[PDB]
Scaffold this motif. Structure first.
Motif, PDB file in Angstrom:
ATOM      1  N   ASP A 154     -22.441  60.539   0.024  1.00 55.18           N
ATOM      2  CA  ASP A 154     -21.703  60.761   1.291  1.00 55.18           C
ATOM      3  C   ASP A 154     -22.130  59.665   2.266  1.00 55.18           C
ATOM      4  O   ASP A 154     -21.597  59.620   3.370  1.00 55.18           O
ATOM      5  CB  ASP A 154     -22.008  62.146   1.863  1.00 55.18           C
ATOM      6  N   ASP A 155     -22.999  58.767   1.811  1.00 57.77           N
ATOM      7  CA  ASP A 155     -23.616  57.773   2.717  1.00 57.77           C
ATOM      8  C   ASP A 155     -23.453  56.335   2.203  1.00 57.77           C
ATOM      9  O   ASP A 155     -24.476  55.691   1.994  1.00 57.77           O
ATOM     10  CB  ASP A 155     -25.111  58.119   2.784  1.00 57.77           C
ATOM     11  N   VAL A 156     -22.239  55.791   2.150  1.00 52.89           N
ATOM     12  CA  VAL A 156     -22.084  54.402   1.622  1.00 52.89           C
ATOM     13  C   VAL A 156     -21.887  53.408   2.774  1.00 52.89           C
ATOM     14  O   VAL A 156     -20.981  53.607   3.560  1.00 52.89           O
ATOM     15  CB  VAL A 156     -20.921  54.314   0.622  1.00 52.89           C
ATOM     16  N   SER A 157     -22.722  52.370   2.840  1.00 46.97           N
ATOM     17  CA  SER A 157     -22.624  51.333   3.898  1.00 46.97           C
ATOM     18  C   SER A 157     -21.603  50.257   3.527  1.00 46.97           C
ATOM     19  O   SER A 157     -21.329  50.084   2.349  1.00 46.97           O
ATOM     20  CB  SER A 157     -23.949  50.722   4.208  1.00 46.97           C
ATOM     21  N   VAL A 158     -21.079  49.569   4.535  1.00 41.95           N
ATOM     22  CA  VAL A 158     -20.091  48.476   4.344  1.00 41.95           C
ATOM     23  C   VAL A 158     -20.738  47.394   3.487  1.00 41.95           C
ATOM     24  O   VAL A 158     -20.153  46.896   2.538  1.00 41.95           O
ATOM     25  CB  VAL A 158     -19.596  47.987   5.713  1.00 41.95           C
ATOM     26  N   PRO A 159     -21.992  47.017   3.758  1.00 37.02           N
ATOM     27  CA  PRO A 159     -22.679  46.049   2.907  1.00 37.02           C
ATOM     28  C   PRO A 159     -22.725  46.492   1.448  1.00 37.02           C
ATOM     29  O   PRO A 159     -22.508  45.668   0.571  1.00 37.02           O
ATOM     30  CB  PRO A 159     -24.078  45.911   3.519  1.00 37.02           C
ATOM     31  N   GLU A 160     -23.008  47.760   1.194  1.00 32.94           N
ATOM     32  CA  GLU A 160     -23.076  48.258  -0.207  1.00 32.94           C
ATOM     33  C   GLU A 160     -21.678  48.207  -0.828  1.00 32.94           C
ATOM     34  O   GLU A 160     -21.572  47.777  -1.940  1.00 32.94           O
ATOM     35  CB  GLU A 160     -23.579  49.692  -0.257  1.00 32.94           C
ATOM     36  N   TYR A 161     -20.646  48.610  -0.097  1.00 28.73           N
ATOM     37  CA  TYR A 161     -19.243  48.508  -0.557  1.00 28.73           C
ATOM     38  C   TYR A 161     -18.906  47.026  -0.871  1.00 28.73           C
ATOM     39  O   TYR A 161     -18.286  46.773  -1.920  1.00 28.73           O
ATOM     40  CB  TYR A 161     -18.262  49.106   0.461  1.00 28.73           C
ATOM     41  N   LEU A 162     -19.279  46.065  -0.007  1.00 26.61           N
ATOM     42  CA  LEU A 162     -18.866  44.641  -0.227  1.00 26.61           C
ATOM     43  C   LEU A 162     -19.590  44.087  -1.452  1.00 26.61           C
ATOM     44  O   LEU A 162     -18.970  43.388  -2.253  1.00 26.61           O
ATOM     45  CB  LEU A 162     -19.152  43.811   1.023  1.00 26.61           C
ATOM     46  N   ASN A 163     -20.845  44.467  -1.624  1.00 24.39           N
ATOM     47  CA  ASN A 163     -21.635  44.104  -2.825  1.00 24.39           C
ATOM     48  C   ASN A 163     -20.945  44.681  -4.071  1.00 24.39           C
ATOM     49  O   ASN A 163     -20.821  43.958  -5.086  1.00 24.39           O
ATOM     50  CB  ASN A 163     -23.093  44.538  -2.658  1.00 24.39           C
ATOM     51  N   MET A 164     -20.442  45.921  -4.005  1.00 23.25           N
ATOM     52  CA  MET A 164     -19.841  46.538  -5.201  1.00 23.25           C
ATOM     53  C   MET A 164     -18.551  45.780  -5.566  1.00 23.25           C
ATOM     54  O   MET A 164     -18.388  45.384  -6.762  1.00 23.25           O
ATOM     55  CB  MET A 164     -19.602  48.029  -4.964  1.00 23.25           C
ATOM     56  N   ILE A 165     -17.638  45.590  -4.611  1.00 22.63           N
ATOM     57  CA  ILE A 165     -16.364  44.895  -4.930  1.00 22.63           C
ATOM     58  C   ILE A 165     -16.617  43.425  -5.297  1.00 22.63           C
ATOM     59  O   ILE A 165     -15.852  42.861  -6.134  1.00 22.63           O
ATOM     60  CB  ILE A 165     -15.301  45.040  -3.835  1.00 22.63           C
ATOM     61  N   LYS A 166     -17.704  42.840  -4.820  1.00 21.06           N
ATOM     62  CA  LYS A 166     -18.027  41.458  -5.232  1.00 21.06           C
ATOM     63  C   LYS A 166     -18.278  41.459  -6.730  1.00 21.06           C
ATOM     64  O   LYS A 166     -17.620  40.651  -7.459  1.00 21.06           O
ATOM     65  CB  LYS A 166     -19.234  40.918  -4.470  1.00 21.06           C
ATOM     66  N   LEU A 167     -19.197  42.320  -7.180  1.00 18.70           N
ATOM     67  CA  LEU A 167     -19.547  42.435  -8.629  1.00 18.70           C
ATOM     68  C   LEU A 167     -18.332  42.886  -9.445  1.00 18.70           C
ATOM     69  O   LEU A 167     -18.103  42.367 -10.553  1.00 18.70           O
ATOM     70  CB  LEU A 167     -20.720  43.408  -8.781  1.00 18.70           C
ATOM     71  N   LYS A 168     -17.564  43.840  -8.952  1.00 24.80           N
ATOM     72  CA  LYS A 168     -16.542  44.491  -9.798  1.00 24.80           C
ATOM     73  C   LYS A 168     -15.284  43.620  -9.898  1.00 24.80           C
ATOM     74  O   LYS A 168     -14.609  43.709 -10.939  1.00 24.80           O
ATOM     75  CB  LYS A 168     -16.171  45.862  -9.223  1.00 24.80           C
ATOM     76  N   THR A 169     -14.924  42.930  -8.818  1.00 24.03           N
ATOM     77  CA  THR A 169     -13.638  42.192  -8.810  1.00 24.03           C
ATOM     78  C   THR A 169     -13.732  40.706  -8.433  1.00 24.03           C
ATOM     79  O   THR A 169     -12.789  40.024  -8.714  1.00 24.03           O
ATOM     80  CB  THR A 169     -12.667  42.860  -7.832  1.00 24.03           C
ATOM     81  N   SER A 170     -14.804  40.247  -7.804  1.00 26.28           N
ATOM     82  CA  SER A 170     -14.844  38.848  -7.305  1.00 26.28           C
ATOM     83  C   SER A 170     -15.620  37.885  -8.201  1.00 26.28           C
ATOM     84  O   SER A 170     -15.162  36.778  -8.366  1.00 26.28           O
ATOM     85  CB  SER A 170     -15.372  38.821  -5.919  1.00 26.28           C
ATOM     86  N   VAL A 171     -16.742  38.305  -8.765  1.00 24.81           N
ATOM     87  CA  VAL A 171     -17.549  37.350  -9.592  1.00 24.81           C
ATOM     88  C   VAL A 171     -16.688  36.748 -10.701  1.00 24.81           C
ATOM     89  O   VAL A 171     -16.941  35.612 -11.062  1.00 24.81           O
ATOM     90  CB  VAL A 171     -18.857  37.952 -10.139  1.00 24.81           C
ATOM     91  N   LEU A 172     -15.711  37.462 -11.256  1.00 26.49           N
ATOM     92  CA  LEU A 172     -14.899  36.929 -12.356  1.00 26.49           C
ATOM     93  C   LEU A 172     -13.923  35.885 -11.812  1.00 26.49           C
ATOM     94  O   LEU A 172     -13.500  35.047 -12.600  1.00 26.49           O
ATOM     95  CB  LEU A 172     -14.155  38.035 -13.080  1.00 26.49           C
ATOM     96  N   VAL A 173     -13.539  35.972 -10.555  1.00 26.09           N
ATOM     97  CA  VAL A 173     -12.679  34.938  -9.919  1.00 26.09           C
ATOM     98  C   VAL A 173     -13.483  33.637  -9.838  1.00 26.09           C
ATOM     99  O   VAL A 173     -12.984  32.626 -10.325  1.00 26.09           O
ATOM    100  CB  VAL A 173     -12.191  35.392  -8.547  1.00 26.09           C
ATOM    101  N   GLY A 174     -14.670  33.705  -9.245  1.00 25.33           N
ATOM    102  CA  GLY A 174     -15.678  32.640  -9.228  1.00 25.33           C
ATOM    103  C   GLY A 174     -15.887  32.055 -10.607  1.00 25.33           C
ATOM    104  O   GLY A 174     -15.835  30.823 -10.772  1.00 25.33           O
ATOM    105  N   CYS A 175     -16.088  32.921 -11.581  1.00 24.98           N
ATOM    106  CA  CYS A 175     -16.445  32.533 -12.950  1.00 24.98           C
ATOM    107  C   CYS A 175     -15.287  31.752 -13.553  1.00 24.98           C
ATOM    108  O   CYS A 175     -15.540  30.764 -14.237  1.00 24.98           O
ATOM    109  CB  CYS A 175     -16.824  33.778 -13.764  1.00 24.98           C
ATOM    110  N   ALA A 176     -14.057  32.261 -13.449  1.00 24.61           N
ATOM    111  CA  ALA A 176     -12.859  31.598 -14.005  1.00 24.61           C
ATOM    112  C   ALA A 176     -12.777  30.154 -13.453  1.00 24.61           C
ATOM    113  O   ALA A 176     -12.489  29.251 -14.241  1.00 24.61           O
ATOM    114  CB  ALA A 176     -11.605  32.375 -13.670  1.00 24.61           C
ATOM    115  N   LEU A 177     -12.994  29.960 -12.155  1.00 24.09           N
ATOM    116  CA  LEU A 177     -12.947  28.617 -11.514  1.00 24.09           C
ATOM    117  C   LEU A 177     -14.116  27.764 -12.046  1.00 24.09           C
ATOM    118  O   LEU A 177     -13.853  26.651 -12.567  1.00 24.09           O
ATOM    119  CB  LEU A 177     -13.005  28.783  -9.995  1.00 24.09           C
ATOM    120  N   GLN A 178     -15.333  28.320 -12.031  1.00 20.55           N
ATOM    121  CA  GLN A 178     -16.539  27.636 -12.522  1.00 20.55           C
ATOM    122  C   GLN A 178     -16.325  27.180 -13.956  1.00 20.55           C
ATOM    123  O   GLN A 178     -16.756  26.033 -14.241  1.00 20.55           O
ATOM    124  CB  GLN A 178     -17.797  28.444 -12.257  1.00 20.55           C
TER     125      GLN A 178
END
Ligand SMILES: [Mg+2]
Ligand SMILES: [Mg+2]
Ligand SMILES: [Mg+2]
Ligand SMILES: [Mg+2]
Ligand SMILES: [Mg+2]
Ligand SMILES: [Mg+2]
Ligand SMILES: [Mg+2]
Ligand SMILES: [Mg+2]
Ligand SMILES: [Mg+2]
Ligand SMILES: [Mg+2]
Ligand SMILES: [Mg+2]
Ligand SMILES: [Mg+2]
Lengths: 327, 327, 327, 327, 327, 327
Positions: A154-178
């Motif tokens: 019941d206690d999720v911070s914006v920083p924890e949310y941004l870290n989660m979506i980074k790992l779940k959906t963004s690192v692969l965008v980075g990776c594809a370009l890299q």
């Protein structure tokens, strides 16, 4: 770089040519099925664009681009099972068309087929590709687990949310370009700069998906409007809305009702009412601001890449088009 | 080579030291759990033995040995889900202790962690390790699918059965040995010779498991005696038994009863009666002959390896001990 | 005091005479059913014994004695629902014979009928009876909740366990005795002394039930031997057994297996193996010591009661007989 | 008497102050939850109004008023379980938010807490309060069982229906008023007169609920319009409608379709069609007549109470406002 | 008459020859399956024996004999569905091997195929065959419904039980004999005499099945010993046992426990205990007396048939052998 | 012939008079229920019309007409079970109102009651009636099985579809007409001519039902519009639509989505979209052409019957009215 449309056309030809396993059918039929559901193929095309911008050909980057797409589809296959999704892109999910055990095993086979698509690269690029690919794949697993863990918190911070979506959906965008940069022979410092662009782009893209889930135009065979609301997913839109002490208590009370305890009409009223709280709280605007902010960070990353100014203009336009803005 | 007991002791120390991911717990707790269920760790120890015999150290081969074990355990985690197994080695399966979604995602994370354990190798060995590992992993997927396909076939040949158990249980034995040879710098021709030994050993080992499933000594927290019979699995024991036109019709009729349509006592009578048909048909003896035959093929493979005669004696004894014979 | 057998005979006559509601049958048929399952009726007979010892008649205490039994049976009816019990005393539970909704509503009606049985008492005793009865009833609810909470805790202390069984099973023993004392006109200080006896007796009795659940003689229509073990209930026997660092790890591992993940034979092996750990750890002896210790505390309480030495001898013998010892 | 709004404000302050049990949370968290779902708190306010009208204070009557509300909420908690209700007042039911076992046990704890709220009264009022409370509570159980029995009867008379709703919903209205009168020291004859008012008011109120279930204005998080029709509940509206030999056969045929054998649109057509039969048969008017008739009986009861004419005017207006009429 | 063994051999040849429908397989495969489960084929052989005794050939009666067997098997197919039977004669039931819808439709097709087997008879016999067959088939439906109705009755008389087993199991014995007599051209008075023999034989046979269900020798793939006891079927054995006021109450209490509320060991104890009550009550002896009595009635019927004394000796011996007695 | 309305009135009188079995109620109550659901009774009225046209009375044909209706209703009872239908003609199906076992057994009893209604006919007509009735009944079983087999086939030809609907829905139309002709004493050649009319009429009628399932006017308690589409039934409308290579691929893709994987709105969009493909492909017109073509074939059959020109005009008008055209 070639046009998206030109790259996509070459990509779909090379996909059909390089993914040929057919027997046993119980294993490989679902691979052809999930790769044939269409759409934009954003992730593989980032690999081809990166390659061209840094001097290589699409053709050189193609096996790695196909690995990226096979990988992404492997994640969708397991995710559709874990999320109990009935449809993907207007068609039955693999576990519905076949069965759960088919989804588990075929997805496993697709992860391995992705790794195998690196094998034509020279030993130096092979090593670099495998290393960023594996780190990315394991990060995607961690992001999935964080998103599951948030369901009972019941206690999720914006920083924890941004870290989660980074790992779940963004690192692969980075990776594809890299990976395209690795194929062009670029150095680690440059590879990390294009990776970073991919992170900011991927975060903007996912924050946009959070926004459009609530406020997007309805498509019957498209994403349900208000799915995040119905499932009480604590997305950026909800997390920012509850920062407003005026709306917070009755938002938390809406987010306490399970959809299984509700009629259709109650679900629709919940979606209309929560959408209104999202606007009135400042949460909707704060979400559009965060998308804008990540997009600008991505545009500044483009300005610093070691690519021709044409290449920066093409990438800048592609980034704005992806975020539903104009060139 | 060092003694099994010495290699196992070093292996369990290095396992604890090299598999350290702990957060998020929802992802990694089940990895530590499944790696702590004990037993012989045959597969990783083949990697260490191969390495030593060809001139390298255990320490050099260790990361690859650990990859093999992480890989094998990844397959058990998904397999326990797909087979609806409640217990493994007297303890709850991962999907029972946690949930199915944990089993799916943690198993995915373990396959990726296995690949990552190759990263300390030089670019040449890294390439060779990844290539035989990936081919083996995809073969294991194919073997799983064949075994599933056989469930709904009334017409399975001995050749098709031997091909399935080769892919499902033997190629990884070959692969584990081949990886130690790669770490020692041996050439492809030699690597394939040790691989081939692993194939014949792995086939003997699995034919032995088919035999002991019916005729093995009962262990309450061990493998159920007659599980293959209860589940109507068409193993080498059944396939050879039905070659006898005297037993074939009433064996096929026993193999038509689902265990869900039967009482405990009917299941026990089915196991006793089918066991008797296995003996009287010649199927049991034909199974012991095939195990004997694969073991001899494995012993001849050992005679042709480019290793010291000590090393051949140690390997010859290890092969006989594995097959429950004496040195 | 009269003999148990004489009190029980009068009690069963007065029960039939004072519980006469019959319509609607859907509500009251299950009340007659659960009150007709037989046994020792220990709790109501404590009320009658207390009354006689302090100078009143059985007849005076009878309505309060019947309240106690109606109350206790109300708790069994809801408990059988919450514990999914199929049988009670060799007969179908109320929710199995009828339905869950019958069990919920009939149990509610029985709690209210219990309260009504106080109404013939004078205003002073009525007040005192209601007050200790209600405090006891609410304590029994708290004990139930603690026992539920312990199911998901891996860290339960002996003090927390003794507090839970005091609330869940002992306060009503105290209360039944205290009510007889109230009917005899005894003062609060004396009422609390007999209450305290009931607490120590009730704790000894429940610790005995913990012991006999594992080590008791099997009765087919009686309590299952090893039910606490099968259900992983952390009773005094288990809590003391794990204080031994030699047994603790493999006891905790047995207590991690759910019975739904196990065959009959695995459950029976778990019961035999855990029973052996209970003996060898010192847990079984420590349980017999705690029963002995509570029984002695109860005997000392009897020595201090304001009752005739006959009455103390009768109570002392009743306490020893209850704990399966001799006079 | 003070205004409803003034009494409600004092009542909600005193509720928070007098219901303070918090540990164990698994037992008491649901008590705070169900008492915080809001609304009119009609029943406790009848107790306070009765007290004031007959000379006592709200403050004197407060513990008894709170008992009434705790009791009523105990009935809703068990009723929501037995009726499989997902929502109460737009929020999850206790058994949905927690579990059924929580609903059973917490409801039991609330009945006992209600009884305990009488303990500050003098021995004479304590006795009188407990006696009318217990008789009322057991009557409410009988009314529940009658309503269940009517589900499988095709032959329910208007007299049997009025007897059921009297026990299930009206005796507690009577009781709440009678308790305020007891606290003011009024005699039995007067107590029964205010009780009788409560019976006629409670019957009018429930007949109004029967009417509004079919013909009431829709509220999405409010009571479903046509729930009684969908569930084939034989309410006063249906019982009077079938007295018309023109409508009776096709009303009985609509009331033979289970909603589980029907689509949404069939359910909506059934509600529109049955609503029309209710009007055309004379059943709707006969229901409005019975509400009018009970309201008049209640107004005549007010004229005969031993209270000041102000008090009769306030009560007369409160009765008309409750029945959605004007002063 | 020819020997049973000779008639059975001819019958199984003619069955294979006259039941040839194969397409569509989804309809007719289950007909061949259920007709191939073996056993004594008592009913069709009564038709052939009747025919021979009265002057016709087996060959003349054969199509009618096959109708009888197809009919009987049609009843077993629907009965196995309605009784949720998993096995018949050691093999999967049709609805388990295929599905329920296959069982429903194939059974319907078999009833119609039975009727069609009359079509080669002359118009006079065709008429007579159809008439006694249809009356018998509808009586078998009524007997089935009575047996279902008895499940929820606590008050079944011996006369009502004998009427039910007459309709459910005996009229078809009568009918099979009567059909052979019709084929031989015998008159109605004679046809009814052989019919009556069949009634008394069929009642003896079914009373024997009631007896052996409790007291019969166990066969693992045969009828469960104590199935009637486990399922609380009120058979002649139970109905006579409860006439004894000494045993009646504790027999009715055993017959109140559902087997779903019981462990294996409780079920076995119930079977041993009820078996003992059956002996001690006089119920077992009263059952053997009723079998003896029906057998004697059948023997007297044989003495009055218009057949050669050889034929009476053969029939008398067949009747005694059927009832497990000696010639 | 008499008017439909006159024949229907006589038919419903004679039905009530000739179907009188009432005990046991558990068997026969559902027979009265299903025969009382109303509608056009087309099939029995064909029997009466045929009889009159060829010289007999309605009264002579009545028992056979009632057999036809009892038979048809027997098929609906089993079909409603096998198709899991909740409602028939706006009322609960037999298996929903009672249970599946009631549906199975009552349907069996109705088939037998149908056969019995032939028994008042002379031996010659009795024989002829039974023979065409039984052949028709077994054909209806085959048609049902073909329709089930088509569910798992992706390759169904128009010829195979027309053969299936002939067996499942048309042979009984033929049969009903042929039975009236048999009662009038007509010869086999004439009987076959009226039978053939019934085949062409029945095929037109069923092709019309295929058309109206998609394009028919909605009735809430009537047939769902688009049920065949929702259930992916490959009817004439779909089979003709996919002959168009422009529409075929996206029709096959719509027909791959199960309705259990879809929301209401997705199902409605599928129905609107598939309806549009049916029009645009030419499938809808090709369906209207086939209905027109079968109707003309039926009209030509009428011209060749040996009946008075009045009788041909009445039959020609009845055929056009049945197909929703005008006289
Ligand atoms: Mg997606
Ligand atoms: Mg997401
Ligand atoms: Mg294993
Ligand atoms: Mg295997
Ligand atoms: Mg107990
Ligand atoms: Mg306990
Ligand atoms: Mg309410
Ligand atoms: Mg109500
Ligand atoms: Mg049988
Ligand atoms: Mg029977
Ligand atoms: Mg129909
Ligand atoms: Mg159809």
């Amino acid at each position: 770089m070639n046009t998206l449309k030109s790259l996509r056309t070459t990509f779909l030809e090379e996909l059909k040519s390089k993914v040929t396993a057919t027997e046993p059918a119980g294993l490989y039929d679902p691979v052809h099925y999930i790769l044939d559901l269409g759409g934009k193929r954003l992730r593989p095309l980032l690999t081809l664009m990166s390659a061209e911008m840094y001097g290589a050909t699409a053709k050189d980057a193609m096996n790695a681009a196909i690995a990226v797409e096979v990988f992404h589809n492997f994640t969708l296959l397991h995710d559709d099972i874990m999320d109990a999704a009935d449809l993907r892109r207007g068609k039955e999910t693999v576990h519905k068309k076949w069965d759960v055990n088919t989804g588990i095993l075929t997805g496993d086979a697709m992860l391995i087929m992705a790794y195998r698509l690196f094998e034509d690269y020279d030993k130096d690029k092979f090593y670099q590709l495998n290393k960023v690919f594996s780190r990315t794949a394991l990060e995607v697993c961690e992001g999935q687990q964080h998103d599951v863990d948030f369901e009972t918190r019941d206690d999720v911070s914006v920083p924890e949310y941004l870290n989660m979506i980074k790992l779940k959906t963004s690192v692969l965008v980075g990776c594809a370009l890299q990976m395209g940069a690795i194929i062009a022979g670029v150095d680690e410092k440059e590879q990390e700069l294009i990776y970073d662009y991919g992170i900011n782009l991927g975060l903007a893209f996912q924050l946009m998906d959070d926004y459009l889930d609530a406020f997007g135009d309805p498509e019957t065979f498209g994403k349900e409007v208000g799915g995040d609301i119905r499932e009480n997913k604590k997305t950026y839109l909800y997390l920012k809305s509850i920062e407003n002490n005026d709306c917070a208590t009755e938002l938390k009370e809406w987010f306490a009702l399970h959809f299984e305890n509700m009629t259709e009409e109650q679900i629709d009223e919940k979606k209309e009412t929560v959408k209104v709280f999202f606007e009135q709280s400042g949460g909707a605007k704060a979400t559009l601001d965060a998308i804008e902010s990540y997009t600008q960070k991505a545009l500044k990353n483009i300005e610093e890449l070691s690519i021709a100014p044409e290449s920066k203009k093409q990438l800048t336009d592609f980034s704005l088009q992806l975020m539903g803005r104009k060139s």
